[PDB]
Design a binder for this molecule. Structure first.
Ligand SMILES: CCCCCCCCCCCCCCCCCC(=O)OC[C@H](COP(=O)([O-])OCC(O)COP(=O)([O-])OC[C@@H](COC(=O)CCCCCCCCCCCCCCCCC)OC(=O)CCCCCCCCCCCCCCCCC)OC(=O)CCCCCCCCCCCCCCCCC
Ligand SMILES: CCCCCCCCCCCCCCCCCC(=O)OC[C@H](COP(=O)([O-])OCC[N+](C)(C)C)OC(=O)CCCCCCCCCCCCCCCCC
Ligand SMILES: CCCCCCCCCCCCCCCCCC(=O)OC[C@H](COP(=O)([O-])OCC[N+](C)(C)C)OC(=O)CCCCCCCCCCCCCCCCC
Ligand SMILES: CCCCCCCCCCCCCCCCCC(=O)OC[C@H](COP(=O)([O-])OCC[N+](C)(C)C)OC(=O)CCCCCCCCCCCCCCCCC
Ligand SMILES: CCCCCCCCCCCCCCCCCC(=O)OC[C@H](COP(=O)(O)OCCN)OC(=O)CCCCCCCCCCCCCCCCC
Ligand SMILES: CCCCCCCCCCCCCCCCCC(=O)OC[C@H](COP(=O)(O)OCCN)OC(=O)CCCCCCCCCCCCCCCCC
Ligand SMILES: CCCCCCCCCCCCCCCCCC(=O)OC[C@H](COP(=O)(O)OCCN)OC(=O)CCCCCCCCCCCCCCCCC
Ligand SMILES: CCCCCCCCCCCCCCCCCC(=O)OC[C@H](COP(=O)(O)OCCN)OC(=O)CCCCCCCCCCCCCCCCC
Ligand SMILES: CCCCCCCCCCCCCCCCCC(=O)OC[C@H](COP(=O)(O)OCCN)OC(=O)CCCCCCCCCCCCCCCCC
Lengths: 347, 105, 318, 80, 99, 96, 98, 104, 169, 70
């Protein structure tokens, strides 16, 4: 791709997300999602192989279905309210349709069925964009419609997303599919606390984006798309094994790391509202996420899988890859739990 | 993440298409202009939680302005009783509901 | 009484289409130093009747079709659109006096390519489908300049009303402020109807028009007469659009004779262009559209947007 | 700026005419004396009803009748 | 964890690029057979382009220059009018100059 | 030529609009009496029809307000013939 | 409410279940998607004309333009799939199962 | 209603002439005649999508004869010239990256 | 019957969506969506949306379904049970809905719906010397500055996006 | 010579002359010897329906002047 065209297309993705964030009109929300999808489709087809075309086709179909259901929810809102303000909805049917449409845009279960395939079919930078930047706009729309969101619907979507994102990654050896099922589980965690305290939703979103950006930046720096190719990191760059160790122990919710902070604050705010069983089932289900995280750490850092002879040639060459913000994203995804009351800036 | 950039910069990007009572071209009134103005001027500043209960009557009048469901239900009742009285023979339509009276203006 | 008006529209359309074949063969005859038909009728006037009776009893051609229902619907759609493009034409009064007759004609002429595409789907040839795709791409290509030239002219009209376009040109022909739009319009309407030098289905530069080829086609007379209804219609629309005549409200026959004479001269100008030039290659008229007409059409579209504002000559809405 | 312009007028006169017509369309209403009159005619076209005012007692610039002298006049539109 | 159902799953390629897993051949004829009418061409088209053009001739092969062998010189003269039948007396003149 | 003629056409449009404006008070008065005539006739026929129904309030407002609400098409042409209905509800849309 | 709104909603759900149940082709999926868009256009237009809400008259144009650009993107994806496999069948697009 | 009567008459005349032209040459009983994927082009699809995109830009340009009547003429003239300029920039990008090639 | 003309067109609209949504072929699917777009356009035209109906004909049916048929001619090759069965299933469901709402004058599938014609809910006013729908569409330029900016930017990006992904390199 | 095409052009011109002259004479016959009322805008239809109501014979084209008022 022409780098001028790449810069304009990434600015168009960011512009669509900004138009969803800053606008007060439902048509501009829909325009922003259309702009976002239309611009992100060539980011997925950057390499032009049949897997990227398949992934972009599946992504187009799911996001197009979600966009049309979103416009139907907007149209039923215009029926029962005669206006266009992006605020609470004035019909539970429009609320159900918009919650389904935003669940399809997030890839929350049971609409999760595109996320591992589409994440597998695309490169690691485009997968990073899909799993971090594309979560910002539908969570903003869910942040603005939460007086109208059905409780049972969003909690069913949340627990089904946590359970399916837990049992999905336990069978996987591809790193992109592991990050995709981790995306499903963490979006369940984010929407589970939304009607209770959406500041903790924003906290979980920011900490998840930092940790996912750390993991995809490590995967781009090591050029590893499978577990077994990530295993050969110790014989090439031994510091990267330490970094994937501390980041995967972070994403599993282990203290004293910063990935403990979101789920601890979510359990902390949901038990204020007299819900004990639901965050306990969420917390027990997150052990599956930590299980395949521990599987990755055993395969990469805590053991040494046997390498090949051609690694000796790569010993003689350093990394020329622009590892942008990788030390900053590694430190902020591990050592932020002493700064847990920093969450008040998101209020 | 409702970053209210429009109110921060003072620019108007989409507040004009948002409601029916906004400044329309050639001052065209909407069919529920008064009802939406009453519901908005009721519900302004008191938040959603107080607006769902303290502005329920203006909201009901505005919803029944938009959808006209109570009006159509009333017309269904009147038309059904009228057709029943035509079927029972106890009613004849007047000359001004038959087309034989050469209308007013 | 209104059905009488509909029939006195649509039956003389078919008679004018029938005698356009005679006028074409005669005018192409004398422009080629020969004569057209003069044996079959007195001065050849019974040539279209003889030819229509010949075509209506000639055998259905040789083969069968891929889709039967679209093979039926493509002449039905072609004739229906070719007859419904006439109803907002003000001459001096339109049949259906609609507020958006310009946009109606542009939309129903955008619908006209489905007859081409369904006749391509209907024939069993995979090569006639390619030729139908090339003709569809040609027609939808020149629809772009049709739309933008039409918009640029209606910026001096004030509305989409075709009857207002007679009121607009009471002081001057609208070809005088808009002759580059008029000449690009005339060539683009020439390229809409698959008319020479742009007729690639009925000529060479074609992969399927090739002497012992396949492709069951329909009755040729119906597509032919829908095509000539489109030709006479687009010339009357160009006459109304640029060369709009004087209209006395108490004597409508003055405007009727005037637009009739101008439309006849403009259809003879179609006949006189097709007997003067070789055909374009397909990429040459794609070049003529996308790299010659459309830059000038966008430039003149900006010009006719900004020109009534800088001259204080904005036409009224009503 | 002179040899390139003659060269592109020899090679591609269609595009030279296109950019010339487009450039005049852009820059000419900013140099036109009649652009103000377009605004003045469009705001003086009465699509709606001129809804009258309650005479509280002191509105000297609002007339009491259409044919009164005070009020926005259209002598410029008749005369031009 | 392989199962009975997910047994046919081979692992994906390393660079995620799969192998891709033609051009048109046209028999040609002149449109209206009045000028040439007896031309046959076998094309190899590449969309718009022409990759190979194979003219098939002999469709008007009459065996003129075997019929000449069994006729006299005056009898062989009118075969030359019919070779290039828009260049009649030129071929007459060429055979005349040869004899 | 188009400058002179479109300036003349805008002056003629303003003349037609001021004829409309000078006629609008009379037409508004006639339309007020028109809709009040039709609502009063519908109220009288409701009074002579809706007697057998228990608990019916004749002329009951479906709105909680006492503000004048603009009459609907069914509120005026509801108890009348279908020809008057069609001429009021698709007359201008279907007109030529 | 209005009786025609029931039919336009049921049309959207019919084209939904057509889009939510594939048979073979991706083109039929895009046709069901644009039928969904068509029903959205009609329903939005009937509301905005019914309300006499003037500034939302430009909204169905924006819906039509954005979703036809969406449809052009979908047809380009279909073209790349057909250039890969020869057909637009959805069962050829199953490489990403493993 | 006059329009629907006219469309019904035109569709009926079209169907009647098609019914004639498919059933009238069957009256003369002839003999029974017994003796006895297309290559995809990227350029055809690209000129079709180029039509569709510029037709959407035309669909934005279509309310201009009404938009000239506004009172905010500086804003209206700016956005009108901006839409025609975006159509021109779309054509320029379609030019210079060799999109309009062999169907130029 | 004539007072229920928009309802009759809406029933033909639902029947057309059942016709192509059962998906016999992309060719006949495109045909059914063309006929459906025409009758839904008639629904729009009978409320006073003349410009929006002609936008359906000129843009939707005139450009986009032309491009869908153009691409379908380049995808499938020219020459059942589930299609016809789902067609008659949708036809039975729709005529049962029609029979219920015509015998009861109130139905509740998801929302409540009237059984009379939709002529009742119109307005009894005039607009003057303009179409309100035409003036609201004309206001895309003076009022809708940001809307035109984002729509034109999305169309320019759409041109760039189609040239990037169809290049294959 | 060249004027031999003029009978066919004359027949085609008469066939183009028939629809417009026909609709002009039908609009004068159907509307009281005058033009058909053009109602593009709702004010024109409002006045036209007012004319239909004030004529008494359910016709918009029956004009009532100063003889109708006292
Ligand atoms: C407000 C929030 C601001 C957040 C940070 C904004 C910048 C980062 C985002 C953009 C980006 O990617 O920039 C590249 C990025 C470097 O990313 P990289 O590729 O990983 O660099 C690694 C090596 O440094 C590459 O080495 P090199 O050889 O290429 O060159 C050395 C380079 C040379 O230095 C320069 O070129 C700088 C001088 C020029 C400045 C610009 C002039 C124009 O030095 C550095 O860049 C040193 C690191 C600078 C600090 C990086 C982290 C910043 C803070 C991030 C947020 C932390 C939040 C903590 C909160 C805790 C509680 C929640 O930043 C820069 O190059 C400039 C940094 C400017 C820091 C300003 C801090 C105050 C802001 C107010
Ligand atoms: C409506 C009534 C009739 C109208 C007139 C039409 C009748 C005459 C028809 C004649 C027969 C035509 C048969 C078909 C011919 C098709 C080929 C053809 O002509 O191609 C077009 C040719 C194509 O170009 P070309 O092929 O000749 O040139 C080669 C081009 N390159 C180098 C790119 C390969 O020309 C055009 O496109 C011109 C279109 C119209 C131009 C209008 C000019 C306006 C100028 C205004 C002033 C500009 C100066 C600068 C600015 C000044 C400002 C103050
Ligand atoms: C308005 C636009 C123009 C409309 C078209 C022109 C108007 C006239 C249309 C009808 C023309 C005459 C009938 C069709 C031609 C029949 C010619 C023919 O050879 O038919 C042989 C056929 C069959 O003849 P056959 O049995 O001898 O067939 C011999 C041929 N083989 C051996 C190969 C089978 O004739 C008929 O079937 C007669 C049909 C009806 C004829 C008229 C009846 C009265 C109608 C009043
Ligand atoms: C690229 C953008 C170029 C055009 C910028 C806006 C031009 C314009 O007319 O603005 C005034 C117009 C209209 O302002 P106005 O001056 O007509 O305001 C008078 C109030 N009304 C309209 C109700 C009569 O737009 C705005 O003020 C807000 C929209 C544009 C905001 C800036 C967009 C920048 C996009 C950057 C990417
Ligand atoms: C309420 C919240 C509101 C919003 C707050 C902010 C949200 C931040 C969301 C971050 C999303 C990041 C998406 C990916 C980075 C964006 C730029 C981009 O696309 O970079 C990829 C780029 C492409 O280079 P290319 O050559 O294509 O690489 C493939 C190999 N040839 O280059 C590369 O591939 C280089 C490899 C390294 C790239 C690392 C990029 C890290 C970016 C994220 C930083 C962390 C987020 C900011 C801090 C937290 C904020 C909440
Ligand atoms: C394969 C299928 C068959 C193919 C062949 C047949 C179909 C194709 C050819 C016919 C196309 C029919 C087009 C019908 C609508 C045309 C647009 C239209 O109605 O425009 C005219 C006018 C709008 O202008 P305006 O003046 O503003 O309105 C009156 C206000 N005084 O508006 C009016 O005057 C409104 C009049 C009442 C509304 C008329 C609605 C007609 C019925 C619905 C459409 C029927 C056709 C369906 C198929 C269409 C094509 C797919
Ligand atoms: C400022 C106002 C707004 C301006 C924008 C609006 C424009 C309206 C017209 C729309 C045009 C759309 C398409 C434009 C494409 C331009 C680029 C181009 O075509 O470059 C290629 C061309 C050489 O073509 P080639 O690659 O050989 O292709 C085969 C063709 N024979 O290269 C060339 O032919 C060279 C073209 C560039 C030089 C032209 C100079 C014209 C100067 C005219 C006088 C000054 C006018 C003031 C404005 C100037 C703006 C540049
Ligand atoms: C309960 C959920 C479904 C509601 C509608 C049910 C209608 C009856 C059909 C039942 C399912 C039959 C079936 O086989 O569906 C699958 C079929 C696609 O599969 P296909 O390739 O056609 O055939 C092989 C069989 N799988 O799928 C299709 O063909 C689906 C076509 C969808 C069109 C919907 C039309 C309206 C249906 C009623 C309203 C909903
Ligand atoms: C808006 C206007 C539209 C006008 C459209 C039509 C234009 C052309 C009008 C007609 C022009 C003149 C026609 C003359 C035809 C030849 C007549 C003739 O002489 O036929 C001779 C033939 C055999 O007769 P026989 O008895 O053998 O003669 C030997 C005598 N020693 O005898 C016969 O063949 C028998 C008689 C045949 C007569 C045919 C007449 C022409 C019919 C054309 C059909 C349409 C006519 C117009 C309809 C509308 C106006 C009324």
């Amino acid at each position: 791709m022409n780098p001028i065209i790449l810069i304009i297309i990434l600015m168009t993705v960011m512009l669509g997300t900004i138009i969803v964030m800053i606008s007060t009109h439902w048509l501009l929300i829909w325009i922003g999602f259309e702009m976002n999808m239309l611009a992100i489709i060539p980011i997925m087809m950057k390499k032009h192989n049949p897997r990227a075309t398949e992934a972009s086709t599946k992504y187009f179909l799911t996001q197009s279905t979600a966009s049309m259901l979103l416009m139907m929810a907007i149209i039923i809102n215009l029926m029962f309210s005669g206006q266009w303000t992006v605020m609470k909805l004035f019909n539970p049917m429009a609320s159900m349709l918009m919650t389904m449409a935003l669940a399809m845009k997030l890839g929350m279960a049971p609409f999760h069925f595109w996320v591992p395939e589409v994440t597998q079919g695309i490169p690691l930078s485009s997968g990073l964009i899909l799993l971090t930047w594309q979560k910002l706009a539908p969570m903003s729309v869910l942040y603005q419609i939460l007086p109208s969101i059905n409780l049972d619907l969003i909690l069913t979507l949340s627990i089904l997303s946590i359970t399916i994102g837990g049992w999905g990654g336990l069978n996987q050896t591809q790193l992109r599919k592991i990050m995709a099922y981790s995306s499903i589980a963490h979006m369940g965690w984010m929407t589970a606390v939304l009607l209770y305290n959406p500041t903790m939703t924003l906290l979980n979103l920011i900490i998840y984006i930092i940790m996912t950006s750390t993991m995809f930046t490590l995967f781009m720096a090591n050029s590893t798309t499978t577990t077994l190719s990530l295993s050969h990191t110790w014989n090439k760059a031994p510091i990267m094994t330490i970094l994937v160790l501390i980041t995967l122990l972070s994403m599993g919710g282990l203290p004293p790391l910063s990935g403990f902070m979101p789920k601890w604050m979510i359990i902390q705010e949901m038990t204020k509202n007299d819900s004990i069983i639901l965050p306990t089932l969420m917390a027990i289900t997150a052990l599956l996420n930590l299980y395949f995280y521990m599987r990755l750490t055993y395969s990469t850092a805590l053991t040494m899988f046997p390498s090949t002879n051609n690694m000796k040639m790569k010993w003689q060459f350093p990394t020329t890859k622009r590892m942008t913000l990788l030390p900053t994203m590694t430190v902020l995804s591990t050592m932020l739990l002493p700064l847990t009351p920093i969450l008040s800036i998101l209020e | 993440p409702f970053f209210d950039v429009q109110k921060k910069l003072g620019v108007d990007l989409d507040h004009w298409m948002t409601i029916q009572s906004a400044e329309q071209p050639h001052r065209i009134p909407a069919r529920c202009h008064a009802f939406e103005k009453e519901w908005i001027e009721c519900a302004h500043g008191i938040g959603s939680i107080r607006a769902e209960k303290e502005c329920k009557i203006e909201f009901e009048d505005f919803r029944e302005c938009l959808l006209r469901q109570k009006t159509m239900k009333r017309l269904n009742a009147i038309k059904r009783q009228r057709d029943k009285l035509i079927k029972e023979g106890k009613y004849t339509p007047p000359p001004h509901h038959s087309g034989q009276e050469d209308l007013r203006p | 009484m209104f059905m009488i008006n509909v029939l006195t529209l649509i039956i003389p359309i078919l008679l004018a289409v029938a005698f356009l074949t005679l006028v074409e063969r005669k005018v192409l005859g004398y422009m080629q130093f020969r004569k057209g038909p003069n044996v079959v009728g007195p001065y050849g006037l019974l040539q279209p009747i003889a030819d229509a009776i010949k075509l209506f009893i000639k055998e259905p051609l040789r083969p069968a079709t891929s889709s039967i229902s679209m093979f039926i619907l493509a002449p039905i759609l072609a004739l229906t659109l070719a007859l419904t493009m006439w109803i907002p034409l003000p001459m001096p009064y339109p049949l259906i006096n609609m507020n958006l007759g310009v946009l109606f004609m542009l939309a129903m002429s955008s619908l006209a390519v489905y007859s081409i595409l369904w006749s391509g789907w209907a024939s069993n040839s995979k090569y006639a489908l390619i030729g139908a795709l090339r003709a569809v791409a040609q027609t939808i290509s020149y629809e772009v300049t049709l739309a933008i030239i039409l918009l640029s002219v209606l910026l001096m009209n004030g509305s989409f009303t075709l009857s207002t376009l007679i009121i607009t040109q009471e002081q001057v022909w609208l070809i005088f402020p808009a002759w580059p739009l008029a000449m690009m319009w005339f060539i683009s309407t020439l390229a809409e109807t698959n008319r020479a030098p742009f007729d690639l289905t009925e000529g060479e530069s074609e992969l399927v028009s090739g002497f012992n080829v396949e492709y069951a086609a329909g009755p040729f007379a119906l597509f032919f007469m829908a095509e000539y209804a489109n030709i006479i219609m687009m010339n009357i629309f160009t006459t109304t659009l640029f060369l709009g005549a004087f209209h006395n409200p108490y004597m409508p026959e003055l405007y009727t004779i005037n637009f009739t004479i101008k439309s006849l001269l403009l259809s003879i100008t179609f006949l006189w262009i097709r007997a003067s030039y070789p055909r374009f290659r397909y990429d040459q008229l794609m070049h003529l559209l996308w790299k010659n007409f459309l830059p000038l059409t966008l430039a003149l579209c900006m010009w006719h947007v900004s020109l009534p504002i800088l001259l204080s000559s904005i036409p009224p809405q009503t | 700026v002179a040899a390139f312009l003659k060269n592109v007028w020899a090679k591609e006169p269609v595009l030279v005419a296109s950019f010339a017509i487009a450039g005049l369309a852009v820059i000419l209403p900013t140099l036109s004396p009649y652009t103000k009159y377009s605004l003045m005619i469009n705001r003086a076209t009465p699509y709606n009803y001129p809804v009258p005012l309650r005479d509280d007692g002191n509105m000297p610039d609002v007339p009491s009748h259409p044919q009164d002298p005070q009020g926005p006049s259209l002598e410029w539109l008749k005369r031009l | 964890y392989p199962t009975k159902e997910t047994a046919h799953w081979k692992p994906p390629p390393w660079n995620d690029v799969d192998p891709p897993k033609s051009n048109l051949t046209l028999n040609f004829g002149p449109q209206h057979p009045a000028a040439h009418g007896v031309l046959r061409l076998v094309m190899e088209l590449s969309g718009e382009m022409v990759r190979k053009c194979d003219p098939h001739i002999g469709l008007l092969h009459r065996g003129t220059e075997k019929l000449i062998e069994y006729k006299t010189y005056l009898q062989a003269l009118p075969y030359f009018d019919r070779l290039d039948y828009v260049s009649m007396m030129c071929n007459e003149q060429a055979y005349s100059l040869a004899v | 030529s188009m400058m002179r003629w479109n300036r003349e056409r805008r002056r003629l449009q303003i003349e037609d609009f001021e004829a409309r404006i000078a006629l609008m008070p009379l037409l508004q008065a006639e339309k007020d009496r028109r809709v009040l005539q039709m609502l009063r006739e519908n109220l009288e026929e409701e009074a002579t029809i809706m007697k057998d129904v228990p608990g019916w309030k004749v002329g009951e407002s479906v709105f909680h307000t006492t503000r004048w609400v603009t009459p609907m098409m069914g509120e005026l042409y509801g108890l009348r013939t279908g020809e008057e209905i069609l001429s009021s509800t698709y007359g201008f849309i279907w007109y030529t | 409410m209005s009786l025609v709104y029931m039919n336009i909603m049921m049309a959207f759900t019919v084209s939904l279940t057509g889009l939510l149940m594939y048979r073979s082709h991706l083109m039929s999926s895009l046709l069901c998607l644009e039928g969904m868009m068509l029903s959205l256009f009609i329903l939005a237009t009937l509301m905005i004309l019914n309300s006499h809400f003037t500034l939302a008259s430009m909204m169905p144009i924006i819906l039509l333009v954005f979703a036809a650009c969406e449809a052009a993107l979908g047809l380009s994806l279909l073209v790349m799939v057909s250039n890969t496999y020869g057909t637009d069948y959805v069962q050829n697009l199953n490489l990403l199962q493993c | 209603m006059n329009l629907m009567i006219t469309l019904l008459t035109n569709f009926t005349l079209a169907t009647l002439l098609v019914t004639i032209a498919f059933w009238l040459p069957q009256l003369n009983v002839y003999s029974e005649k017994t003796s006895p994927r297309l290559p995809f082009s990227m350029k055809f699809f690209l000129v079709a999508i180029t039509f569709l995109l510029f037709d959407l830009e035309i669909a934005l340009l279509l309310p201009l004869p009404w938009a000239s009547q506004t009172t905010n003429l500086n804003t209206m003239l700016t956005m009108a010239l901006l839409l025609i300029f975006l159509l021109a920039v779309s054509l320029a990008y379609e030019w210079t990256q060799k999109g309009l090639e062999w169907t130029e | 019957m004539m007072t229920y003309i928009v309802f009759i067109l809406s029933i033909i609209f639902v029947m057309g969506f059942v016709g192509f949504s059962s998906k016999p072929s992309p060719i006949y699917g495109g045909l059914g969506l063309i006929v459906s777009g025409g009758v839904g356009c008639g629904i729009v035209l009978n409320f006073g949306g003349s410009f929006l109906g002609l936008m359906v004909f000129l843009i939707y049916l005139g450009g986009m379904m032309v491009v869908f048929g153009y691409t379908t001619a380049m995808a499938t090759e020219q020459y059942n049970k589930v299609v016809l069965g789902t067609f008659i299933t949708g036809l039975l469901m729709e005529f049962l809905m029609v029979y219920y709402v015509l015998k009861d004058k109130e139905v509740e599938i998801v929302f409540k719906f009237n059984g009379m014609g939709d002529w009742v809910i119109y307005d009894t006013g005039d607009s003057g010397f303009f179409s309100e729908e035409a003036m609201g569409i004309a206001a895309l330029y003076s009022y809708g500055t940001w809307l035109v900016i984002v729509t034109g930017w999305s169309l320019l990006i759409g041109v760039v996006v189609i040239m990037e992904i169809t290049r294959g390199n | 010579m060249w004027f031999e095409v003029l009978p066919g052009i004359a027949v085609m011109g008469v066939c183009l002359f028939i629809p417009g002259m026909a609709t002009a004479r039908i609009h004068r016959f159907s509307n009281g010897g005058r033009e058909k009322r053009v109602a593009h805008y709702s004010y024109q239809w409002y006045l036209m329906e007012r004319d239909r109501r004030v004529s008494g014979v359910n016709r918009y084209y029956v004009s009532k002047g100063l003889e109708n008022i006292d």
